[PDB]
Design a protein around this ligand. Structure first.
Ligand SMILES: O=C(O)[C@H]1[C@H]2CC[C@H](CC2)[C@@H]1Nc1nc(-c2c[nH]c3ncc(F)cc23)ncc1F
Ligand SMILES: O=C(O)[C@H]1[C@H]2CC[C@H](CC2)[C@@H]1Nc1nc(-c2c[nH]c3ncc(F)cc23)ncc1F
Ligand code: NI
Length: 277
């Protein structure tokens, strides 16, 4: 049970990475899934029975019409909506380097939990606004990673304005990343202009919680607008999802739940033998 899961993830990640470089990735992935065995059992038979929710694995499940977790993955983090709703409106925005970006802006009030491996968070947000972020983590590194993802996800104008120079990030297949991911890789290379330009505010010490400044220094006095660090940020609903040619998994409203771009780069050595085509 434990070894099949470890091995299935490794096989799924390899398949999505190989498929993603092909002209029609969906068809490539479907080939490899149907002609791959893990410890002697067929991979499609493992997918039908195994309950693991992982980004590469869930892309493969979707590919063959299996139900998956309704969560979505942004910046490595799993997001579950705990409350509220939104609608979608495409808008042109202008970066700090005067580059147009067409963005599907979400309009509404929504509350989510973010769960990464080294940090978790509660996010509350409105139309192009971070309302509040309560974040936990292992360290300075891991906490800042979660803050950058929440800031980009919020769609705020100060985040858009803090962009410096052009955004032409590409995937392994030489195709441009879509705008939200363009923004995310930019601020993942450097979040300094982002944090400086975000804004600061006075806070009252709720015990358990602390402020954090644009240089990541804690404080009891001030914090970055909306953001508080904490010490412990507190089950699966399977649903039908869709898949396209480029392995983008979507909900019924067309929000991208998963993609090649949200599959972890970790190479790892399988515990049960994996035989490909
Ligand atoms: O995909 C498979 O491995 C099996 C299982 C899971 C999907 C189908 C239903 C059973 C598929 N069944 C069959 N596939 C195929 C088959 C040939 N090339 C393929 N490439 C991708 C694929 F996906 C299925 C196939 N041929 C006869 C079948 F009878
Ligand atoms: O809009 C999309 O197609 C994708 C890409 C950009 C961010 C998410 C992950 C990739 C997004 N997916 C999803 N977003 C959302 C979503 C709700 N409110 C939001 N506000 C801003 C935002 F940015 C995304 C959202 N819900 C479910 C999703 F599944
Ligand atoms: Ni994207």
């Amino acid at each position: 049970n434990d070894d099949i899961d470890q091995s299935l993830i490794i096989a799924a990640r390899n398949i999505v990475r190989r498929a993603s470089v092909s002209a029609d990735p969906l068809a490539s992935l479907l080939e490899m899934c149907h002609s791959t065995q893990i410890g002697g059992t067929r991979m499609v038979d493992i997918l039908r029975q195994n309950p693991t929710e992982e980004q590469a694995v869930d892309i493969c499940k979707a590919a063959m019409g299996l139900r998956i977790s309704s969560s979505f993955s942004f910046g490595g983090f799993t997001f579950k909506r705990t409350s509220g709703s939104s609608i979608k409106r495409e808008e042109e925005v202008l970066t700090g380097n005067l580059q147009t970006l067409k963005i599907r802006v979400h309009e509404g009030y929504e509350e989510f939990t973010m769960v990464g491996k080294r940090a978790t968070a509660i996010l509350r947000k409105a139309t192009r606004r971070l309302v509040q972020l309560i974040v936990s983590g292992r360290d300075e590194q891991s906490i800042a990673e979660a803050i950058i993802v929440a800031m980009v996800f919020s769609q705020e104008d100060c985040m858009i304005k803090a962009v410096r120079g052009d955004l032409n990030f590409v995937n392994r297949a030489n195709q441009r990343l879509n705008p939200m991911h363009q923004l995310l890789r930019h601020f993942q290379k450097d979040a300094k202009v982002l944090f400086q330009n975000w804004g600061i505010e006075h806070i009252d010490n709720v015990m358990g919680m602390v402020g954090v400044l644009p240089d990541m220094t804690p404080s009891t006095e001030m914090s970055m607008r909306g953001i508080r660090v904490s010490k412990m940020g507190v089950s699966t609903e399977r649903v039908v999802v869709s898949i396209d040619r480029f392995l983008r998994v979507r909900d019924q409203r067309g929000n991208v739940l998963l993609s090649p771009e949200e599959v972890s780069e970790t190479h790892g050595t399988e515990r049960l033998t994996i035989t490909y085509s």
